[PDB]
Structures are given as structure tokens and as C-alpha cells.
Design a protein around this ligand. Structure first.
Ligand SMILES: [Mg+2]
Ligand SMILES: [Mg+2]
Ligand SMILES: [Mg+2]
Ligand SMILES: [Mg+2]
Ligand code: NA
Ligand code: NA
Ligand code: NA
Ligand code: NA
Ligand code: NA
Ligand code: NA
Lengths: 1015, 1015
């Protein structure tokens, strides 16, 4: 029947013999074990070594496999994705389906994973009760056999499939055979923008329940007006034979203290003309002054559900963590415990560079700690229900969760083709309903989502209403079909900009500020995805947060996204390197578009993370006179683990510093009066830096963790004192080919043919490897490239405009090169035109003034043709001979910062190793810039002015020519790019120009000045 | 795979390889044929003689049957139910499922119908295009084979199942094999209160569509504020390969005049980020001053949908009737074309006494004609989608239709066990979605219903919203779970009473007047079921209509129900008789509860129909002096086929009459001045009767049809004249056992032992067969019995209270019997007590005064113990020796009428054959009463007074002892029951006391007087 029915090409069959979904069960037979959440003897993990054989299709599976281990099969670890063991290739595609679009059919060549396990079941489980097997995750569809007999079938890669094995198991040795199909009709609802893998990728377990058993339970908590009183309402459902002596006790615990308890026999209230549920009971417990759950303070109680007898004999016990919180939208605002939330969220896929889509505790805990340490309080499960442990950790560490149905049909044309089709309603309904049935008791889940990128169809409205009817405690959201449809309680757009409208037909992305106030619109706005963090990105992040803080109904959003989906590959020498789309022979693919994270795949932070941390701070600061006003954006907690450090520095030189304890109520303010500052006579800018430090360790952070910061300029004393007049005068030497200047052991050489400083000598040592030349281009960022699909070529993308205009191939034509001797200096005057096909793109006019003190003052005035696309940068570059270990600068740092991503950086004296001045983006691009720099030091060299710079062993040319970071080779010496001006990086999205007008280099005329000297 | 999978015990499989649902198709290849709705050569009927074999289970079907006929099978007509051919028994159960409640499982003994057909398929049908088979109704599940090969499977008994046979057929002879299962998992959703049958009971046909085809189309009509302008919007979908030369033309016709036309290529507007529907097109046609559709004037247009090439080759045409109307709920009122409807509705099952649940055009038309002739304007499809032709006939004749999904789970405990279960949402969703997809273009359908008696579950809420999303043009209603849930636009209770609350826990039935004004309630109220017409019923019908006319938001209801579900059986002599539950060996069963109709199964009216007709009249009347005020309750039409006839009579004797044409605007009034009526000389009451007559035939009625009537009392002249004094004196003779009175040829005999008139002589011929005795009981009506289930005994039911009180077995005890000779009379005085086990129930005190003119004046004074249940009647009865041909009376008539059902009856002189004075209710009961009678004539006898009477060949005793009307035998002579007082019949429902307090005999003391004489 299996090969004949083809259940995997029929959306009307999504399972056979599958048990009903439910909340996490462990079937404890001891109440104390249930209370403490300790292991249950009745719940057994089947994770470990399994037998596995790969086949190109289900027809290729030999019938002997049903009863006998195949000798060709390998021993593998389970849970696993079989692409990670190398049996076939993982595929990265964004929108376009990995299979031909022909529902409900899949390719006849359908990679098939035959898993099997020989295992022992103890005699006790056979005589009495029910033994079920639970597969927490099988991608994408599977048939199940036990001891050669067919058991059932299951679909939906992201939710547990469970089957009764009581009638299939025997004394001693048993064998399970699992035939997993890569493709099925389920694949049409699984078109998420991520790697396409398959296999038994989440836990496998055996659970033993009595015949008379708790089959479901729901915990609800409702509150009075000031949250001083709560009622915990618990509905408990049973299966098995009903008896008059049966009882349910629900008890609520706070540590070892029982705070409330209720006991009742089965028999619900009358529901209709035919009665009520005899097999159900609802317990109501009163709790006075409950401790409330939030992400700020994740207060939890333990509920223990006991199925027992009247005379006091336990049959079984289940349990859950309970967080007392209320979620409601009121007057246009999303409230938690009566207070408006500000969502500092991030989208997080389930990804590991080694293990694929298999999740483990260590990695999950790592992500949560890093999220909380960087001021995130919310996570969206993009775009499927997660590994069950994720919700436990969110409950316990404290994160708001958007739990999202495993439904995405992005690749359909139009996007709603399936979701508007009633024939696909059954498949869709199960992905929503079984999610709710599983996760409804988790306090961390505050919002339900209907899925992702599936247009808006009538099936969405049906399922929206289903959830609203079944669980009034959580809003339902869904972005598809315009982000403000009838299927959503929350205006939840993706990549809607702050001020700029994007008026796409049918599905516009309005300015978020404008969207709120459209005629008739009353709902809160929280972006489900924003600030697309692909490569060198998060330009304009501060603009979002300013708007979130200003507009009550703008309640934040979820950054896209947490972690790069890069996979580990190995070269000839067995050295690991980060791979993306296409690196596995997978075609078609969408290349580096799988990497959009704030962190690298190994959870090393990208520079963008510190900007996110800074903008998402829970303390806001103002300065007036010497008064710092600290405002708390905590809704619930006081600042009981916070002190304020302050320091004043004169151009990086410390002058005064102190600390003050913070005592701010939620939403409150504290005024801190700075002591009288000893002013300096010497010139320069005084800078005040404040930092909020957590003196004590928490569950999620170390002692001394810095949670917030801010800088202000204080007094400036401008330098008026003349530089000490030098005795020596530099000497000009003229030839046909070169102008040469000499002063002591220093020589400067200007090539009269090129018009550039071609060489510098300190004694007989050459300082340059490539001449000092203007640069107007950058190695293109993912944002400049502006591509979401590898097939899509957009003439409007920045990089395409720069290419089409000749920016990358414009050659410098010399217009003027003259030398003059002054009283105490030599003056070199130059002029250059950059042209492409008879069109002058840029003109640079310079003076180099070399005085008797050995300083070269470079003055640069640039013209940019108003009709050429605005250049990526306006500066100079050269390759220095020197390779030094350290880079020292007075400017914004310490991390990479760009003009539209520099709010997190602070002005100070910074000193890093050279390798830290390069950001290892997996797809190489312009990187490592630091802005607002007044002084840069490298080996013998010092540069002074007001510039942006990067410095590394990689030229812009190499960076733009190399597709992977592991293929980069250090060049001879050091490439310095010093910019007068540099373009924003943008990132509102990465598939259209996203750089805001004010960060584009459109002024037409530009001036900057540098002093180069040897200190 | 078939016997192994058991798809009929799987709610997750409701079909296999079934094609998408759609509006009625005929695939015309000529546009004129499409327009005129003439037969299509591409649509062939497979109705006629098929091959049938019955089997106790599917496992008993011989595998030979697939490829070859079984000679042991019979030739039967299709469509049919196989219970109607004798193969097994039809089962009548109300609530309790006909199978053990063990979802999804059905009994292993699952009766199985093996249908097969051998038929010709022409070559032209297989060379080009697609050949599909359509099963309009198969009860309840089936597998399909074509030429031995398995095609598919389908569930839902009440919607068409369709399969592509293109790859299965050959030129010339082919064979179909259909294995129909009586029970399936679909039976759990098919628990309607009706005969449980099975088989291919609706049409089977073959449809040829071209490869490039119209696969769906939707017609919408929207209007400006005053309906002077309309836009017809038609969405058309195609299958096949898309081509730039393809076009759709939608043309709209009014008779032979084309009114509007639109032509367009395929390609819908942009829908989302992925584009729009390339395979769809929407045509918009402007119509100025559209002729509007309503039940009053069913104006229809013809829409022809042409799929063709740009240069004009027709590929295929589909078509439909279009009715321009708007249905909306505004400010708590249901509006059609801007006007508030008053629903004069009835529930109608698909029932034929000879053919079961097979429907034919003739029966459908008969039903529509009778409905409209009796002032109905609406029908509810209780409780499933109907035969497709019903909707066409409702479109054309003009009836408002509630189209209801085939979902009833009444027998579940609680009622919502399956409807609140997400596992059953897929099966439920198809029963809703496929109905809407089929019927959405029929203008007669004004409201969608989600099913019946399935409680209220989350699945209802989901499917409610689905319909609201897909079709905004029609309100959605559903009664389950209390009639005012979140799943209904209309408060739609069943059997809620007018003034009386029924406060059931969880699902109360409030007084309808009170329900409207409950805090926060704003919706309209229209009863889905009311005035249960079981047997002698519809008491209190006028109370509903009074309330409907007074309260704007009470907008009517649907009577339960149209036609008795009785089936024909044949006796030993081959004579037909009407059978109800239990008469087929079916057990358990609910007996006569299948008969609740206004008409008998052969469409002969019950007496209740005339009461409905009268109360549902469209003209209302008031009298003031000589002025008649006629008010129209038409919303749209003027009274252009109506004349008012009026007549004044003095105690039945005509004195003056006339007629006046009616000219009343919709909702308007007309004043009619009666001419001066000459005074009558003689005594008596003048009566005015008005009738609205339709001079012209219509599509639904004959010339001279009476649509409305009303009566008033005018002047009364009370008789003051003394009856001529006679010179004869009656003579008293006394013995131990008798008082005898003689006058001329007349003799009366009073038995002194019993105290009753035991005999009466005219010309020494005996007039009585049984003495004249008081009667306080009636052969109980179905309403008195008070049973919805044959297992349920209710001590509160009228019959049970009467029985427990000993009313039916109390015997007369003589207290007094005396005789006095007077001047011109003999006076007999009697007194009796009726007692049961020590308790005196009633006392009757009488005088009989026999004077010289031969008249016997009887005066009766009765006492009824205040603590005994109020008696059914207070009167006399006797068995007359005479059988006469005619009954002549001055009173209310001509039809049977009871105190709470006499509004339709008129006071006049009526003359009927004796048989008309008996109503042949299938379950015999008290019947044939006529109220407000002043004079009764039968043979030589005349009774005068003010009484209610019935007269027949059947005693109350025989009536109450006989379970079927065919088992009744005429008794010797004629039983006369003359009542001073008679209890109401009730009928708000038939399973609880429903007689209103004002119609109960609770006064304690009663008085009436009769004069008995010879004329
Ligand atoms: Mg499937
Ligand atoms: Mg997508
Ligand atoms: Mg089934
Ligand atoms: Mg029912
Ligand atoms: Na806000
Ligand atoms: Na991506
Ligand atoms: Na590159
Ligand atoms: Na009304
Ligand atoms: Na009934
Ligand atoms: Na009877």
C-alpha cells in the first residue's frame, strides 16, 4: 500500500495513525519528581547510534530492509541531517522552490533516508499501559515500521509525530524502520529562505503512559485591574476508562512552597443540549499578589497535574512551568501586565555550521545569553515551531517569543495560490493547530504567527479565527498580503522604512510612522523583520529606534536576523572554511543570501551587534549643565544591579572619573550631579563618557557587564598657539620625470607624469609600495550589490550604477603638476580629471605643503559631476611598505563603524592589533572603517585631520575580486584607505538601494585636509 | 490497497482523486444554446437501468465484480435508495446515531451496494478533451472503478463527486463499478433527524470539457444607494495552457435583448509580491436601472461566459441565471435591496413516500407551488445542500433560500465533541467550502448555514470566517451552541417561544422579544425552526406573527417543517399505507417523530397549512365604521393582480356583497368605503368577510386564487322574541330503573342508575347506541404525548399528568337524579362525581328541560379540582345510531380548528361530507374539532348553543388505542363530541408542555348550555 498510495504526493494525507498533539509530557509516577522537573523513568531517549542507508527514491528501497539490517548501511548519530554526513548535497535557495512547481507532485528522484534501530524494551512496559514513540522532527515526511509491521505516516518537519507502539512491541529485541522522504506535498508549505536539508533531525523518544491517562491540559491565568489577584484556571482531559473514584489535583508551587491547590472529580460544566465533557475537569486556583512573569524578571511557578484516586493513590503526573502574565492589545497598544512593550527583537533560525539544523542545549543557551547581553528581549521563531527546549529556556531566562506556524509558500505565483485554495486548508490547519496544542502553556510565547510569506488567502482568515477562538490569551499576527490584513492583530511589515514610503502595487510598505495613522487604522505596529543585517549592514538602525521611542504605537521589531547560515567545508589540507549557496554543487542557488546575521555561524559577533546593543539600551541619557538625567525603559524592575561610571577625557587623556549607584524605578528618572571638573589650559575637546555597569553576575551575564553607554562633547579649547618655528628649510629638486623634496633624512618624490606622490624615504628605506592616489570606489557591500536572488540583475543597485558610469574603470588624467619654493616650505600643486568615455566624473585639486618640521599638509578639493551616481567614497589610498603589529587612533571605536552605523562607537584613544582592523565577512567587501578620526598612528607614520579610515593587508581590488574570505591572501605591506567622506552602508533591506539621502555623497564639491608626518 | 486502507473509517480521507467543486457546468459549444439554457450535447445523463447487488460488508464483495458483471445481481433504476427497493431496511432515528458511537469506526457489518453500468462512449469524446463523471449524490461513501481500474473515492452524501475518466475509457463499450458503503466516518457528520438510507440517490452524468476550459466562475452584483445603478462583476478561471490570444466574454441578457458585454484577455491584477493570477480574469459590466430579484418579483438575467480566441472561435460557453439583489445586515436588520425582510419560511427535507430521498422535478415544482400559494417566501435546506435543480427553481419562481452545509453531529455527547476537535476540521471544512463553491451564483440563496445541531466548536468559528472572507454578499448563520454565538450573523434559535423564557443551562431559549434586547445584543432574530407541525399542531401560530409584525428586529422564521417523512408500505391485500419509525424492523427508532409536516407525504395539506397561509398574508386589514384599511406588506411590488371582495351575512345568510380593485403601493395603505348596508329585520349577528382574489394566473397560481382574508363582527341584534307557546305537555313515566318522557312521536329515557340519557326515540326508532355522558379527556395529540425520543418518558407531559391523575379511568358516580313535572315541561336534574382512588376530580351538575315544542334544553355546570391537571375538554359525547352523509354547522370553518388555532377559520354556514370532518393524521389522535359553533345539524338532529364539536365514525377510545390511521375501522353509527370548552393543542415544540396558559382549562368552574331538537 505504501508505494501504491504515494501519500507524499497527496495534501489530503498529512498523517496516518498519528496520535493527537499535546503539551510536553513525561508521565511521572512520583509527584515530587514532577514538581522538580527531574528525569522520568517513563520517558526514554532513543537518541544515539542508528543504522542509515541512502537511496535516490523510495522505489530503490529493498523490501528486506523492513525486517533485516542492510549490510551496506552505516552507523550514524541521530538526531542528524543526512546532508551533514555527506550522503547528498544541502541546497540553498531563497524564493524559488528546490523542486519543480507542480502541486502536489514531487520529483521521481526523491532522496530517501532509511533509518533503523535495534533496541530493548523492558518487560514492565509490555504487560500494562501504553508505549508511544515520539519523533520531534523529521524532514520532510516519513513512514514508520515496527518489527516489520507498518505503523503510520507523518508530515510537517517542525512538529512532533507520535504513534502508539503497544501492539507492535515484543519481549527483548525490537527493530524500528523509518523511511524518510526529502520531498513531499509538505515541501510546498516549507519554502523558507534557508538551507534545504532532510532527515531525523530532532529527538526520538519512547513515552509510557497508563491506559487511564492525562491526555491534555491547558493552563490559563487571569488578573484583576492592578494584578494584585489572579485566578489560575487549568483544564485537564483524560483518556481511558472513567471511574467514580478518579480525581485530578492541580497544585501550584513556588520553590518548595505549595501556594495553591484544587481537587475535583471528572465532569465538566454543561456545554450544550447533550451535556458536558465527562472526560474533562477544570480546576480554578486563587493566587494573591502573584509574582509576574516578564523578560525583565522571569518569575515562574510550577504547576503539577495529578491524575489520582479519591482515597489518595497516584496514577500519573504531568507538569509545566507557569508564568503569571497577561497579554492584550488595548487602545492600539500591545500590553504585557498592563504596560506597553518595546520589542527589542531578533529573528532566529535553527542553524549550526557543523550540525546543520540539529539543535542542542549548549548552542541554544549560547544564543540566549548573547541575545540578552546585547539588550534583546524578544525572539521570532522564523519560520516554524522550534525544538521544544527553546521555549523552556525562553520561559526560564526571559524572552518574549513569537511562535510561528511551519507554513511558507513564497515560491508560488501569486504568493497566495495555495493559501487561498480550500483544498490546502487541511494541511495548513494542522501546522497551526498542532503548534498551539503543543506550545500554549509556555509563558514565553506571547504572540502566535500564522506563518511567513504565503500571500493572504482565505485559509489564513479561517485559521486566524480558529486561534482567536481557542486561545484568547495571545494576539495573532501575520505579515502576508500587505502586513495589515484581516488575519493580523498587529501591523507587522517586513522592511518597512522609517520615513520613506515604498508604494508597491497591492502590497505597499508605507513609512512606519505614516502606516499607523492611515484612515481607520488603530492597531500597534511591530515589524516582523527589519534592519536586514547582511554582511556590512545595519546602516540607519538608529533611525528605527528614535521612531520607536517617539511613537507610542511603534512598539519595535525583530531584526533580520540572528546568525549567518554559513556551513563548514574543508579544503585540501583539511582546514575548515565557511560556505554558502552554490558551494555544494547545489543549483539553482541564491549564493550569500543565506548569511544575514548579527553573528557569524560560530556565534562570533559581527560589528553590527554592538550598534544593536547600543540602540536597544534600557537606559536613556540627557545632559544639562553638569546634570545627567538617566531614564529607565524597564517596565517592571528597578535598577537593582546597576551603577553609573562616568569619565571625562581630553582628546583621549583621562582627567576625571567616578561612579554613582543607580536607583531608578521602572519608567523613572534619576538626576546625577557631576562634581566640578578641573579644566585644562591645553587645547582640545573634552569628552564625557557614561556607562551603566552591572556589578553582580546574573543568570545571563558576568559581573561587570556593561549594559548601556553614551557620550557628549563638553568644553572645547581651540588651539591658537603657533607651531615652534623650525630652523631647516626643505629643498626642491627638479627633473623631467620627478619633483623631489629633501629635509634631513627624509625624501618625498612626486611623479610629474602621473601627478602623484609615488615614493617617500626615511633614510634609504622606501615607505610606499603603490603611489598615493585618490579613490572614489569601494569593494561593494552586499547592500551595494542589492540582490535577494542570484538570477536578479537590478540596474538600479548602487554597484550596477557605479559600474555603468565607469567609476571602477575611470583613469586619472593629469591637468596640472607644479612646484613652488616658499619661505619655509615646498608647495606642490596638482589637478586631475577622472574620465569615462569622454565624460569627466571627478576632478581632484590638491596642494602638498612640506615644511621645515617635516610635516606634509595635503589639501584636497574634489568636484563630482552632479549627474554621475554619488560616489562610494572621497579619499586617498596607497600601499605602505610597513607591516606593524598595532594600530593606534584617536577617533570613533573600537569596532568597525560607518557614517550611518556609528552611534555605538565612542570617541577615544584606541589601540588594537592590525588583524582587528579587518572584519572577516564571509563574502568579502569594504570593511573595518572607523569614522570621526582626528589622528591615526601606524609604525613610524602619523596622519592628522578629520577623516574616516580603514587599514589592512587586503586591497579594495582583492576584496571585490574574491568571493570567500578564506581565499584572501595578505598582500605585501599594508593598504591604507583614508577618506575625507564615505557613503552610508544602508541596510533597510539588501535588494534595493537602502542608503538614506543624508548619507549619500551628493554635495558636488568636497574638501578635506590631512597632515602626514613621521613621529 | 482498498480493503487494506479502509478509507471509510478515516476522517482524514474524505476523497481520493476527486476534482475541484464548481458551479453548474454544461460545456456548451454554441453560445445560443448556452443563452437559452437548452440541452448540451457535452452533458450526458447516465440515469436509467443499472446493475445492483447487495452485500453485508465490503469484505464480502467478490473480486470478480470489478471486471465482470455478477449474474446474481438485479436490474434497478438509478437514482434510487436501495432501502426503497427492499434490499435492506430504512432506519428512523432522531438523535441517537444508527451505529455505535466509536469515531472514526463504523460497524464491521456495513451494508454495501455494488452498482455497475455498461455504456457506450463515442470516439469524438476521447480524441480531444476531458471526459468527467459526476455523481450528484452518493450515500454515504464510495469507491469507483472504470474498466476494472480504480479511479477514486468520495464522501459527503449531499454534494456532487466528480472524476476524470479520460485515461480510463475506450471507444464503444465501457463498464463502471461503484462500491457504495452505507456507513462511513462521514456518517458521524450526517446525524440529521430523518430516515437513514443509502445509495446513488441523485443524478449520475458524464461531462465533456475541452482541455482549455472554464474551470470556475463567480458572479457578483453591487449597487449604488438607491439601486438605480449596478455593476456585475464576473471572475472567470481557466485550466489548460495559457495563450495571449485567449479571451473571455461575459454577456448579460434580458430575454433576447443583450444589455451589457465585457471582453478581456487573461491576467488578473497584481495580488501580492509574486504578481497576480495569470489564469484568471475579472469582467465588470455596467447595468443601468437593473430589474431587481426578490421572492415577490423574481427578475432574472442570463449571463453567458464565453471562452474564445481573439478573432472569435468559441472554445466553450458556460452560463447561469443572474438575479440582481443585495443582501446585507444593517443596524440590526436583514435587508434585501435595502428593505427589511419578513421571512415567511419553512424547513424542507428531500422526501418522497415512494422514492425515499430521490428528488424529481415534478415533486420539487409541486412543493414550490404549494408553498407560494400558502404565502411562504422562504425555504431552509434542512439540513444539507439540495439537489441542484431546487436552486434553479427557487431562482425562477422566487423563494429565499438558506443553503445549509451537510453537518449534523446531534448524537455526540456533548454535541460539540467533533466540531470543537481540530482533527475533524478537514472533513467539516469540505462540507462547507464545496457547498459555497457549488451554489454561490444562485440569487435565491441569500444566507449560508454552517449545519445543524452540532453544538458550537472552534471549527464553526473557522468556517464562519472562511465564508465571510470568500463571500461577503451573504450573511452566515448557525444555531448550534445557543443560537447567538460568534459563529452567526443572525440570532437563529429553534423553538424559542414568543413570551415564555426557557432558561436551559448553557443554551437557554429566551423569549424572542426578550432575546433581542439582552445587554449588548444588536443582531436580527429569525428562527431557523419554530411552530413544530407534528400531527394536530400549530397552536399559538398567531402569537408568533403578531410578534413578528410588532418588532422590527423580529424578522420571521422557518416552520418545522414542510412534509411528513412517512413512507408507503403495502398490506396483505397490496393496499398502500403510511409508515413511520419502527415499521421496517428498524430498532432503536423514534416512531412518529419523523412526521412533523404541514402537508402529508403525498402533499395533501394538513389543517395547519391554512392557519400558516392566513397568518403569513401579505395584506393586513383594519375596520373603522364603514372603512376598510388595507395595508400592503410587499416590499417591492404594487398590488397589480389583486381585487378585494367583501360580503356581509346575517348568521350565514348573504345580505350584501361587492368588489373593489386593490391599488396599494409596497408598504402603502388603501382606504375602502363600504356602501350603506340596509338593516336586517331579524335577530342575529352580522359578519363581514373580506378576501383578496388574484384575477390573473401567475407562474405559481391559478386565476381566482385567494391570497388573504379577514372577518369582523358588525351589528348584532339580540333576539327578544318569545318562541310560540305550544299546547302540548310532555308526559313523565317512572320506573325503578328509568325516567321516560313522551311527547308526540318523540321519547327520551333517563337511566336512574347511571343518571344519563341512555336512549332517545323518534317514531320509536332508537337514536343512541351509547348514552350521552360527560367527557373530560381526548385521544392525546402528539403535543400531549410530548416525546422527541421513543426511549424518553416525561412525567411532565400532558398525557402523563392526565394518566397519573386517573382522568382516563375515572368513572361517573351518581349523586342525584330527580324528575319534576312542570306546567309545560319535564325537568330532569342530575349530579355526578368522577373520582380516582379517593380523590374527586370533577363534578357535573345538570338540568334537562324537555318542553311541549319538543326541545330539550341541557344546562351543564362543572367543577374541576384546582389541584388536578387541567382537563383536555369539558363536554359531552354519545354514539348516534344514524350515519348521515352531510354535516351542516353555523360556526368556524370549513376546516378543523382548535382554540389556539382558529384564526384562519371563518364564521359562516358550512356544509361538508362526513368524511371531511375527520382529519387522517397518520398517528391517530383527537381531530376534526370545529370551534365557535352556534348550530350543528346531522340527520334529523339539531344542537344549538355556543360549543366546539367533532363528529366521526371513530371514538376517542379507538383513536387513542390505534397507532396508525390505516388500522382504524368505522364504528357503528357516529360518535359526537360536543364540548363547552376544549384545551389548546400547542406546538411551540412537541416534546414539552406547549399549551399557553390562556388556552388551558384552569377556571375551576365551567358553564355551558345546549338545546337538542329535531328539524
Ligand atoms: Mg501527503
Ligand atoms: Mg521567503
Ligand atoms: Mg474517510
Ligand atoms: Mg437533530
Ligand atoms: Na513606541
Ligand atoms: Na536570507
Ligand atoms: Na567580494
Ligand atoms: Na419584524
Ligand atoms: Na422530526
Ligand atoms: Na393514537
Amino acid at each position: 500500500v505504501v508505494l501504491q498510495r504515494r501519500d507524499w504526493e497527496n495534501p489530503g494525507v498529512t498523517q496516518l495513525n498519528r496520535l493527537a498533539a499535546h503539551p510536553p509530557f513525561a508521565s511521572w509516577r512520583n509527584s515530587e519528581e514532577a514538581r522538580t522537573d527531574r528525569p522520568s523513568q517513563q520517558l526514554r531517549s532513543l537518541n544515539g547510534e542508528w543504522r542509515f542507508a541512502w537511496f535516490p527514491a523510495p522505489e530503490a528501497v529493498p523490501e528486506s530492509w523492513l525486517e533485516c539490517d542492510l549490510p551496506e548501511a552505516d552507523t550514524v548519530v541521530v538526531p542528524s541531517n543526512w546532508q551533514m554526513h555527506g550522503y547528498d548535497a544541502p541546497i540553498y535557495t531563497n524564493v524559488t522552490y528546490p523542486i519543480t512547481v507542480n502541486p502536489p507532485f514531487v520529483p521521481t528522484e526523491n532522496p530517501t533516508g532509511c533509518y533503523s534501530l535495534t533496541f530493548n524494551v523492558d518487560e514492565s512496559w509490555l504487560q500494562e499501559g501504553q508505549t508511544r514513540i515520539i519523533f520531534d522532527g523529521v524532514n520532510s515526511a516519513f513512514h514508520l515500521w515496527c518489527n516489520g509491521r507498518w505503523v503510520g505516516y507523518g508530515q510537517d518537519s517542525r512538529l512532533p509525530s507520535e504513534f502508539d507502539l503497544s501492539a507492535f512491541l515484543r519481549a527483548g529485541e525490537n527493530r524500528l524502520a523509518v523511511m524518510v522522504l526529502r520531498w513531499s506535498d509538505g515541501s510546498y508549505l516549507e519554502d523558507q529562505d534557508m538551507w534545504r536539508m532532510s532527515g531525523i533531525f530532532r529527538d526520538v523518544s519512547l513515552l509510557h503512559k497508563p491506559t487511564t491517562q492525562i491526555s491534555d491540559f491547558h493552563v490559563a491565568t487571569r488578573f484583576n485591574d492592578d494584578f494584585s489577584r489572579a485566578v489560575l484556571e487549568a483544564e485537564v482531559q483524560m483518556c481511558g476508562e472513567l471511574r467514580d473514584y478518579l480525581r485530578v489535583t492541580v497544585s501550584l508551587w513556588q520553590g518548595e512552597t505549595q501556594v495553591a491547590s484544587g481537587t475535583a472529580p471528572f465532569g465538566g460544566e454543561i456545554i450544550d443540549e447533550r451535556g458536558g465533557y465527562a472526560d474533562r475537569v477544570t480546576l480554578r486556583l486563587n493566587v494573591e499578589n502573584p509574582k509576574l512573569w516578564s523578560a525583565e524578571i522571569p518569575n515562574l511557578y510550577r504547576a503539577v497535574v495529578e491524575l489520582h484516586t479519591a482515597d489518595g493513590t497516584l496514577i500519573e503526573a504531568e507538569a509545566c512551568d507557569v508564568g503569571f502574565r497577561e497579554v492584550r492589545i488595548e487602545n492600539g497598544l500591545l500590553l504585557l501586565n498592563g504596560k506597553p512593550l518595546l520589542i527589542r527583537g531578533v529573528n532566529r533560525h535553527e542553524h549550526h555550521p557543523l550540525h546543520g539544523q540539529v539543535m542542542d542545549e549548549q548552542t541554544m543557551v549560547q544564543d540566549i545569553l548573547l541575545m540578552k547581553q546585547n539588550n534583546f528581549n524578544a525572539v521570532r521563531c522564523s519560520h516554524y515551531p522550534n525544538h521544544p527546549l527553546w521555549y523552556t529556556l525562553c520561559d526560564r531566562y526571559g524572552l518574549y517569543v513569537v511562535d510561528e506556524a511551519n507554513i511558507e509558500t513564497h515560491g508560488m505565483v501569486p504568493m497566495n495560490r495555495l493559501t487561498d485554495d480550500p483544498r490546502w486548508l487541511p494541511a495548513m490547519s494542522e501546522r497551526v493547530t498542532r503548534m498551539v496544542q503543543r506550545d500554549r502553556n509556555h509563558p514565553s510565547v506571547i504572540i502566535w504567527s500564522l506563518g511567513n510569506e504565503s500571500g493572504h488567502g482565505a485559509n489564513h482568515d479561517a485559521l486566524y479565527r480558529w486561534i482567536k477562538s481557542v486561545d484568547p490569551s495571545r494576539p495573532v499576527q501575520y505579515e502576508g498580503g500587505g502586513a495589515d490584513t484581516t488575519a493580523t492583530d498587529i501591523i507587522c511589515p517586513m522592511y518597512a522604512r522609517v520615513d520613506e514610503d515604498q508604494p508597491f502595487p497591492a502590497v505597499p510598505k508605507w513609512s512606519i510612522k505614516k502606516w499607523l495613522s492611515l484612515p481607520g487604522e488603530t492597531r500597534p505596529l511591530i515589524l516582523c523583520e527589519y534592519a536586514h543585517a547582511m554582511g556590512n549592514s545595519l546602516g540607519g538602525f538608529a533611525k528605527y529606534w528614535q521612531a520607536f521611542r517617539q511613537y507610542p504605537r511603534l512598539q519595535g521589531g525583530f531584526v533580520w536576523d540572528w546568525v549567518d547560515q554559513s556551513l563548514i567545508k574543508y579544503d585540501e589540507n583539511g582546514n575548515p572554511w565557511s560556505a554558502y549557496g552554490g558551494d555544494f554543487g547545489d543549483t539553482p542557488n541564491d549564493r550569500q543570501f543565506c548569511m544575514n546575521g548579527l553573528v557569524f555561524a560560530d556565534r562570533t559577533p559581527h560589528p553590527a551587534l554592538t550598534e544593536a546593543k547600543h540602540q536597544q539600551q534600557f537606559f536613556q541619557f540627557r545632559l544639562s549643565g553638569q546634570t545627567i538625567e538617566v531614564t529607565s525603559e524597564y517596565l517592571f524592575r528597578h535598577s537593582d544591579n546597576e551603577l553609573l561610571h562616568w569619565m571625562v577625557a581630553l582628546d583621549g587623556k583621562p582627567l576625571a572619573s567616578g561612579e554613582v549607584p543607580l536607583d531608578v524605578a521602572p519608567q523613572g528618572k534619576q538626576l546625577i550631579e557631576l562634581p566640578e571638573l578641573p579644566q585644562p589650559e591645553s587645547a582640545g575637546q573634552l569628552w564625557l563618557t557614561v556607562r551603566v555597569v552591572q556589578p553582580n553576575a546574573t543568570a545571563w551575564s558576568e559581573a561587570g557587564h556593561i549594559s548601556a553607554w553614551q557620550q557628549w562633547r563638553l568644553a572645547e579649547n581651540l588651539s591658537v598657539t603657533l607651531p615652534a618655528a623650525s630652523h631647516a628649510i626643505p629643498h626642491l629638486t627638479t627633473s623631467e620625470m620627478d619633483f623631489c623634496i629633501e629635509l634631513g633624512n627624509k625624501r618625498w618624490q612626486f611623479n610629474r607624469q602621473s601627478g602623484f606622490l609615488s615614493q617617500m624615504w626615511i633614510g634609504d628605506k622606501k615607505q610606499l609600495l603603490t603611489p598615493l592616489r585618490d579613490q572614489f570606489t569601494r569593494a561593494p557591500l552586499d547592500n551595494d550589490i542589492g540582490v535577494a536572488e542570484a538570477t536578479r540583475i537590478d540596474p538600479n543597485a548602487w554597484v550596477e550604477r557605479w559600474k555603468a558610469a565607469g567609476h571602477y574603470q575611470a583613469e586619472a588624467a593629469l591637468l596640472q603638476c607644479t612646484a613652488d619654493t616658499l619661505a619655509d616650505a615646498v608647495l606642490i600643486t596638482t589637478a586631475h580629471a577622472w574620465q569615462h568615455q569622454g565624460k569627466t566624473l571627478f576632478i581632484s585639486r590638491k596642494t602638498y605643503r612640506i615644511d621645515g618640521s617635516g610635516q606634509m599638509a595635503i589639501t584636497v578639493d574634489v568636484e563630482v559631476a552632479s549627474d554621475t551616481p554619488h560616489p562610494a567614497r572621497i579619499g586617498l589610498n596607497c600601499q605602505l611598505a610597513q607591516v606593524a603589529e598595532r594600530v593606534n587612533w584617536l577617533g570613533l571605536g573600537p569596532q568597525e563603524n560607518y557614517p550611518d552605523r556609528l552611534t555605538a562607537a565612542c570617541f577615544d584613544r584606541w589601540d588594537l592589533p592590525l588583524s582587528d582592523m579587518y572584519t572577516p565577512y564571509v563574502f568579502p567587501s569594504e570593511n573595518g572603517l572607523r569614522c570621526g578620526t582626528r589622528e591615526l598612528n601606524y609604525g613610524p607614520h602619523q596622519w592628522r585631520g578629520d577623516f574616516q579610515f580603514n587599514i589592512s593587508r587586503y586591497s579594495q581590488q582583492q576584496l571585490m575580486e574574491t568571493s570567500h574570505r578564506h581565499l584572501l591572501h595578505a598582500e605585501e605591506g599594508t593598504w591604507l584607505n583614508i577618506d575625507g567622506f564615505h557613503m552610508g552602508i544602508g541596510g533597510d533591506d539588501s535588494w534595493s538601494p537602502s542608503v538614506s539621502a543624508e548619507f549619500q555623497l551628493s554635495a558636488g564639491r568636497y574638501h578635506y585636509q590631512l597632515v602626514w608626518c613621521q613621529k
